[PDB]
Amino acid sequence: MKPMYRSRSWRRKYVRTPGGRVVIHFERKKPKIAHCAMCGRPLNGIPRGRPVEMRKLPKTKKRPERPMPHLCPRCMRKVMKEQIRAQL
Amino acid sequence: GKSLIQQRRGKGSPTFKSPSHRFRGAVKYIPLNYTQEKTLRGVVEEIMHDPGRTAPVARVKFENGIEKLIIAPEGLLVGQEIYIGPDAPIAVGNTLPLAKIPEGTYVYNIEGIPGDGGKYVRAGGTYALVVSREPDKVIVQLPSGELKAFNPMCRATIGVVAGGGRLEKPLVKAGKAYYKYKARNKFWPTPRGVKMNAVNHPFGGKEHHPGKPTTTSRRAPPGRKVGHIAARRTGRR
Amino acid sequence: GSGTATFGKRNSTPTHIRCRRCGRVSYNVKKGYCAACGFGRSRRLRKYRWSKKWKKKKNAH
Amino acid sequence: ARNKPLAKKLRLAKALKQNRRVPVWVIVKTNRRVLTHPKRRYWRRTKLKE
RNA sequence: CUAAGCCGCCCGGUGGAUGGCUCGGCUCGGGGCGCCGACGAAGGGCGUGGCAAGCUGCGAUAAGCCCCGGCGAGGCGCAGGCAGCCGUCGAACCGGGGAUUCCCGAAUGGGACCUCCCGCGGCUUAUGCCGCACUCCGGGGUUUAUCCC
RNA sequence: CUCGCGGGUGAAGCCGAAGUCCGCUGGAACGCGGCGCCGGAGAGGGUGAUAGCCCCGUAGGCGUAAGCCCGCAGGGUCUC
RNA sequence: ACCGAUAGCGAACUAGUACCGUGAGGGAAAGCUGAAAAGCACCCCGGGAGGGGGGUGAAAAGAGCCUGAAACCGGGCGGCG
RNA sequence: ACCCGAAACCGGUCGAUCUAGCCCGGGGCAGGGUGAAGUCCCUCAACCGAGGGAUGGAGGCCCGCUAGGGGUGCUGAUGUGCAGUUCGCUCCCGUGACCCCGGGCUAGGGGUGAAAGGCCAAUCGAGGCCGGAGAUAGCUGGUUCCCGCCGAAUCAUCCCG
RNA sequence: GUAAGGUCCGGUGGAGCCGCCGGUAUCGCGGAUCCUGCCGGGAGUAGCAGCGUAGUCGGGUGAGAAUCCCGACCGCCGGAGGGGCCAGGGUUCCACGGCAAUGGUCGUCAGCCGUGGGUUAGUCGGUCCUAACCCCGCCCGUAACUCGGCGCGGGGGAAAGGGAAACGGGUUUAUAUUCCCGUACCGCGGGGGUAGGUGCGGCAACGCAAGCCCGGAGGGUGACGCCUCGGGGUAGGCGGACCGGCCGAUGAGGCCGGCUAAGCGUAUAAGCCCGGGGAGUGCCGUAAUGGCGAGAACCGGGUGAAAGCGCGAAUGGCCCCCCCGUUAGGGGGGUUCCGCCGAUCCCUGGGGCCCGUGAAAAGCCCUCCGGGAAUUCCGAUCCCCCGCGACCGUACCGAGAACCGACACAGGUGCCCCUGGGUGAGAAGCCUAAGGCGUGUCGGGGGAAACCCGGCCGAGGGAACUCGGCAAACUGGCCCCGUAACUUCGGGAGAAGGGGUGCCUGCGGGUGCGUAACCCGCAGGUCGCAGUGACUAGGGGGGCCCGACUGUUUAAUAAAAACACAGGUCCCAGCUAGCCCGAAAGGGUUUGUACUGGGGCCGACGCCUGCCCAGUGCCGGUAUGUGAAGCCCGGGUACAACCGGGUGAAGCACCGGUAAACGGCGGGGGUAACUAUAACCCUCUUAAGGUAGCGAAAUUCCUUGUCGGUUAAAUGCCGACCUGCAUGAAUGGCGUAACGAGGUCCCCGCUGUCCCCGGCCGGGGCCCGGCGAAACCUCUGCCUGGCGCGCAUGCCAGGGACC
RNA sequence: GGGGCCAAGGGUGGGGGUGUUCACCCAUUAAAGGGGAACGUGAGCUGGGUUUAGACCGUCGUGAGACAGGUCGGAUGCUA
RNA sequence: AAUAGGCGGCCGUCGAGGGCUCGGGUAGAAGACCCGGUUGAUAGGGCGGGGAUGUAAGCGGGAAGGGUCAACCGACCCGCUUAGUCCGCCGCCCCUAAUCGCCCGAG
Ligand SMILES: [Zn+2]
Ligand SMILES: [Zn+2]
């Protein structure tokens, strides 16, 4: 294989073609799941994908429909409560 | 003759240069104009391990929006609030001018002159003791045991540097020493002048003994100051 | 070692390549200057009176 | 070798075009005086300047 | 009428000395002539001939293009060939004046692990043309940025 | 200084005398023997041998655009 | 009153060329047919390269080309063996 | 200064594709064994305790012709070699102070050195290229035609002689 | 002509040359291990072996065939000699036409010669980002610069890091992810609709098409170490059924084919959440660690990978059959299931380790702030359609012939990435399938020797060989019993030592739904000399020296007792410090701050580390003497030079500390004669006289010291004594488990090391056909006794000798 | 047994420590002789000692270092 | 053996004798040497003798056991079987090849 494909950042898969040939398919690894900005636990409603896969989706299919989608529900509720109590 | 390791170090070659790109950054105080006459409150975001510091570092975000790196004192807690200024309370992790620090207190990261950013008591596990306070100077006992006078406006942090007791455990392995010294690019392993050649060291020779007394004068030229330099005495007392 | 087996490791990047100014294959590619005319290190040509190559170029020696 | 810059490729092209024998009509015109030129090359024995 | 072998002469081979030749060197009193370049130099790279590889000459108008003058019938470089073409409306050649003159190169709008690439402002319908390096001098304007002309 | 005029110089370049007579040798006469000529030209070279007279040239003369120099004439400035 | 192709400049010639070294840099060898190509038409042999006849030229000077020395090699002759 | 020969000294430049060190970014090491910390379980007793059974995978750990790296002995083959340091058998490391690759930096009285005066392009007790330079020597070698006439010396004094 | 030489005759040659006088000069060669060119003997000899020993038969082509081509047979590699592809090479790639030269022989062949060709991209890579680092401008230094440099501004820097988008089939002699066909995707721009501007479902986690344009901020992703384990999946492999084909005996059985890309749609696992619920004389769970009123069991749900499934897609590919077959062609069939294993290839979670913390930026997604346009209007991240997408690389080898090493070099670069079946723990060895090759390229002959290299065997003895058991030999895998001194308690240890091992018949057990797969036992029968039968595959033990260990070193005669190491201890330094580079400017340590930076020595660990500061060093003081210039005072000079004196820093003189600073640690007489001989003892003597230990030592000259053990025999080895020529405590002393291709002695076993050598095999040697050198060479080449520059093939006298 | 004469045809061996020649010792034996041949014999072998380059100990030297003082390792080319 | 010998026989003043070629070793690195060559047992082949291993393939039977206690499988054992295989040793038999041909040679 090429030296560029000898790197382990590529995923190698052996695939049999309909014509009976054996070929190697190379793919790039997916990014890891998003994490909360305050506690670091995994988030929900945000699909994992490379930039092309992310741009293949509409806006509402990438983040949950609730305030502060960058925080997990516990942190979001906590921040809302602190803001409300600070206002009074 | 040939050069010594100390002579070759002064030329700044990559064999002797510090790898100051894998470190977290310099640890200096915020500029003195913010601290003078005003007290700033910050929150500790994270505590990390600086590759070469011998002490953990911490990130502090201040209310004015400035993010800074500080030397974490022992017992510093993530998410806690700290204060810097003349009106700061006397607690671990708070920075105050030396005039407002009561006698008998443990301090670290003391500015040599007001506003330099901190120069003294920065290694892990070290602290200094405030001895006396005067309108013109403040006396502190340093880790080396010397009593030093500082300007009353010099800033210091209350507490003890985290990471003490590091020398309690032996290094055991040459591999452990290799990793420890490679982390900061210190010359390791080290050779011996007696086993060097005569062309290389003042002590070099076929017989592995120093041909002259090992106490060298303070007035010796470069390339000669080896062994015990300007030693007041030698041996075990 | 140090001989025939050593000479087998000459398959890396060449030290010198062609120079755009003087046309000779003397351009230090890694450092970025010409070892013959000084291109990339000086605006003026690299001429030394102990050297006879520039005279040889025009048969003036 | 697989990846080549255009300028180096053009220089190699010039060398390849240079490497050829003297025309028979040139030999006839010169009356067996001009038989060869100093730019003849064998790819495995005499290497290029670049 | 001795097999190998040895010395001398003759013939032949191998080799390239000697001799003769010389469009090349070397050295000189005297005489002549002595700077080129941002109106882009010198040095290079690459192309260019019907058959063309090297040298030489030229630059996409590419062993060449135009104009006044000299010569007067051949000419198409070194370079003895094939086929053709140019010339009496004066060629080839020669003195003078013009046109073209790719890329790199002080290289100069910005970059070079490859003499190859990537831009911004005006005009231009578009093709396309011009301007844009740095350190200064004499001036103008304003945004007073040492920014624009 | 030249709206003007005259001259000198100044490229390629042009002119520039006299045997190619008889016999011999020779593949081929520039050679040999005989008879002639020019010459301010018998320096040198080429030409199928070694040539003053075969050719180029040489001794001596001529011409030349641009440019340069000098002068005439006229118009100005300055100095004592 | 210089040299005459191992000389004279390194280069009389496709010479600062071919070629050597990563690089500064280093750097050769190589001139001559004949007046005129008139550069051998045709025949025999050979797979060819070439060989033998026959032609051109005053002379092969035959392109592997002016003269062709010495060393060396093959044959013939004289002497020894 | 009749001709050739030194080791060496000095100036300016060229080299880290070999090799030494360090930095940035990468690739790799079949299979098996042993069994540290840690976490426990069961039985008989209970004032003490004793015995048995598991799990766990650490190590500059072990065996290893995996790959890769190294080079102890035969003082083996070869030794005008396959090779200006190679081949075979035997042997050693083989998860680590490990091996290798691309991009960089350190240049000569200087670099680099787990220190052998080792390594710095087949060159190292001071690299290479050109220049000073045709350097110098009381030391070694060489010095080209013929005839004719005469024809020595290696002994005294002085010289770092 | 004494001669250096001159001149004639015969032949070749085809164009210049000479006598004499007078000048001039790169003016005369056998040597310089001289220089350049050419040519001899060695020689038709060596080499064309060793690490992979490969060819034979029939046919074809051609003038010519061991060497070129086809078929069969026989072989080699097969975790690489196979497949892919960098750097480097640059046409070596393809076809046709050829053999003057090249190819270790030949050649009709070729990586060779000639003539014509060949590299096609919006998707692959460069191009973009930044890392270590580099350059330019200002500035500063330098006599100056093309030289050195901090700080500011700008730029560059990866063809294996980050990074938009394509995958099947077909086509050419040579290109294809690039050409053709089919089906897609990405970026920009445009046209028509729609969602939204002005919309909903869930308690919630969340599900949703969920407004457009400009600017800014925040979050996420990009984005990361090492060790180790569980879960899910896919390539690949195995067994069985069935349909075609081949082989086999048209028996049994074996073998071959039975295939499915991107893209689009589709969802669960772990992990993390969200509602309900309210436990402990505790429940729950994992391979393991573990979780719970800071909310567990338990019942529901949300989000969330690799994959699978459907379309793509059977008109394609594969296999088989038939008709036409003079060339050229045309059609018909099938391509289906079950079970098991399972990756080093993907996804996903735990756990553990760091005095070690294992990149940045471009880009992309989301959210939030301000600003702008929009109502017979604005308008998408949703659907349909249309247009555009630049420049450069693309052939080939990729190496026991296409790279570097002068080569078709057994080296190095690149083994850089990948691997069917059996045996087996195994990517081991051996055999074999696919793929490749017979080009790690000179062939033929032979009891055709001697001898050499590589290999096998050897009666009796068993190290008698030798400096030395060098080399060789013994043992060997697995299972079960068993295992010493010593010890740092971890080890030593696979110590040592003992028994078993094949095949067949039949049962039992573990996990498992399984009579699938793997593994572990039992009983009986039986064969051989031998059952890990080939292959693979430790010999072992006891003393001593040195070094603690793993590791490093003289590339090319030394791998070690040398270096390094963790540990011990000493010295300097509070920062504008200490140490260091430089001509300076500036700089390294330093994005550092005494648990730190720099400088010596010893060198794990255990017990210890005694005396001496007179000397040489270093440090502190310096009352006092000396002590340069400068300054002051007097003399001198119409002014100076010059002379005398005073002041006089550092440094020396002087005084004190300092030995884990350099070093040192002596020497004579007599005794206590309950013999003789020892220190208790008294006299010079220095700074003090060597303490604990160890000692004929890697240190001992005499020396093979003396005594004891080892042998029949001991210049050895071990133990002891002390007369230590010339041991000794951090240039460390003594001891020491484990470790070692280090030196050394012994024991069992073993053997061709030896007594004492003898057989056999393969390759050379030898002969025949080819290519075809080099080292070296004054000419030559028999001896005895002699002379001689003192050891003669060559001289003298003899002797002998065909080539 | 001791001493001597003629006589050189033949024999004159195997082992332990040590690099050893030599010397010493052991068991046999008729005896276990001394020497020359470039201290015969490395284009025949081996490489233990000696005598380079690495390293340790002792002594000497201020030091670099040295020791006919010990000690471990340290290359043997060939086509007649 | 340089005094380079003696004797018997055959040949010459076309020709005695010999070499290459042929089948094989009492021999051998090339040369050389020795036996045989139709005046024949030299080698091959056929047959027989002697020897070396150790009882072939095939068939029939048995076999610890299994199996629907049937068919059938089964390591191994017994009989045909001093077997089978092989012989770089010997004897007999002209069936095959030892043929054809070329060359030197004193006068
Ligand atoms: Zn959160
Ligand atoms: Zn240049």
- Look up residue B72 and give its two tokens: 């974490």
The answer to whether residues C40 and C34 touch, using CB atoms and an 8 Å cutoff, is yes
What does the angle CA B4 – CA B6 – CA B11 come to, to the nearest 5 degrees?
Answer: 100
CA distance B6 to A76: 58
Question: Which of B34, B17, B169 is closest to B115 using CA atoms?
Answer: B34
CA distance B131 to B108: 14
Question: Which of B16, B25, B55 is closest to B184 using CA atoms?
Answer: B16
CB neighbour list of residue A13: distance below 8 Å, 6 or more residues apart: A24, A25, A26, A27
Q: What is the 3-state secondary structure (H, E, C) of B115-143?
A: CCCCCECCCCCCCEEEEEECCCCEEEECC
The answer to whether residues B106 and B94 touch, using CB atoms and an 8 Å cutoff, is no
Question: Which of C50, C54, C48, C51 is closest to C24 using CA atoms?
Answer: C54
Question: Which of B71, B26, B16, B15 is closest to B44 using CA atoms?
Answer: B71
Q: How many CB atoms lie within 10 A of CB B161?
A: 25
Cross-strand bridge partners of residue B67 = B61
Is residue B195's beta carbon less than 7 angstroms from any atom in nucleic acid strand J?
Answer: yes
Q: How many CB atoms lie within 10 A of CB D32?
A: 7
CB neighbour list of residue D27: distance below 8 Å, 6 or more residues apart: D34, D35
Question: Which of B196, B189, B191, B194 is closest to B2 using CA atoms?
Answer: B196
- Look up residue B145 and give its two tokens: 């045991």
Q: Do C25 and D50 count as a contact with CB atoms less than 8 A apart?
A: yes
- Look up residue C46 and give its two tokens: 């690299």
- With 0-12 CB in 10 A as exposed, 13-18 as middle and 19+ as buried, what is B106? buried
Binding-site entries of C for Zn(2+):
19, 22, 34, 37
Reported as half-sphere exposure (CB side, CA atoms, 13 A), residue B145 has a value of 0
Q: Residue A28 phi/psi, 5° resolution?
A: -95, 145
CB neighbour list of residue B165: distance below 8 Å, 6 or more residues apart: B125
CA distance B157 to B96: 6
Question: Which of C39, C2, C40, C7 is closest to C22 using CA atoms?
Answer: C39
CA distance B86 to B131: 19
Length of chain A: 88
What does the angle CA A3 – CA B21 – CA B122 come to, to the nearest 5 degrees?
Answer: 150
Q: In this structure, which amino acid lies at residue A12?
A: R
The answer to whether residues B62 and B40 touch, using CB atoms and an 8 Å cutoff, is yes
Question: Which of B147, B29, B28 is closest to B96 using CA atoms?
Answer: B29
CA distance B158 to B100: 11
- Give pairs for B73-76: CB < 8 Å, separation 24+: B73/B108, B73/B157, B73/B158, B73/B159, B73/B160, B73/B161, B73/B162, B74/B159, B74/B160, B74/B161, B74/B162, B74/B163, B74/B164, B75/B159, B75/B162, B76/B44, B76/B47, B76/B159, B76/B162
- Look up residue B33 and give its two tokens: 């104009």
- Look up residue B206 and give its two tokens: 């076929």
Q: What is the CA radius of gyration of chain B?
A: 22
The answer to whether residues B89 and B83 touch, using CB atoms and an 8 Å cutoff, is yes
The answer to whether residues B53 and B26 touch, using CB atoms and an 8 Å cutoff, is no
Secondary element (H or E) of residue A79: helix A73-87
The answer to whether residues B44 and B80 touch, using CB atoms and an 8 Å cutoff, is yes
CA distance C19 to C26: 6
Q: In this structure, which amino acid lies at residue B198?
A: A
Sign of CA dihedral B191, B193, B194, B197: positive
Cis status of the peptide bond prior to B189, with omega within 30 of 0:
yes
Helix (H, G, I), strand (E, B) or coil at B229: strand
Helix (H, G, I), strand (E, B) or coil at A51: helix
Sign of CA dihedral B213, B214, B218, B221: positive
CA distance B88 to B37: 11
Q: Ligand 1: distance of its center to the CA of A39 in Å?
A: 4
DSSP string, A5-30: HHSTTEEEEEEE-TTS-EEEEEEEPP
The answer to whether residues B35 and B29 touch, using CB atoms and an 8 Å cutoff, is yes
Q: How many CB atoms lie within 10 A of CB B139?
A: 16
Nucleotides of I under 7 A from a protein CB: 83-92, 111-115, 125-126, 131-136, 146-147, 159-165, 167-170, 177, 185-187, 200-202, 204-211, 218-224, 234-236, 258-262, 264, 271-274, 302-307, 313-314, 316-318, 343, 345-349, 354-358, 363-368, 380-382, 392-399, 402-409, 411-414, 416-417, 549-550, 555-556, 562-567, 569-576, 578-582, 587-603, 613, 616-619, 657-663, 731
Q: Ligand 1: distance of its center to the CA of A80 in Å?
A: 13
Query: With an 8 Å Cβ cutoff, is C57 touching chain D?
Result: no
The answer to whether residues B99 and B74 touch, using CB atoms and an 8 Å cutoff, is no
